[PDB]
Design brief:
alpha+beta; Defensin A-like; three-stranded antiparallel beta sheet; two-stranded antiparallel sheet; 1 helix; globular; neurotoxin; Alpha-like toxin BmK M1; toxin activity; voltage-gated sodium channel impairing toxin; secreted
């Protein structure tokens, strides 16, 4: 695919923790996503979740945040 809903990831395979939904919406959309929100409960715990994040931007995948 070219887009996917998931935890956006930063260097290196680390989710972006969050305190507000807007923080995530901003982070997600400035990276090409349709929108985003803060996930306080999810597959990887607290972290920003993006809707339709372009695939040239990293998402959290199995492994450790390093």
């Amino acid at each position: 695919n070219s887009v996917r809903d998931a935890y956006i990831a930063g260097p290196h395979n680390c989710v972006y923790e969050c305190a507000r939904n807007e923080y995530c919406n901003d982070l997600c959309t400035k990276n090409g996503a349709k929108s985003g929100y803060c996930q306080w409960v999810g597959k990887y715990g607290n972290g920003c979740w993006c809707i339709e994040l372009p695939d040239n931007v990293p998402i959290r995948v199995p492994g450790k945040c390093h």
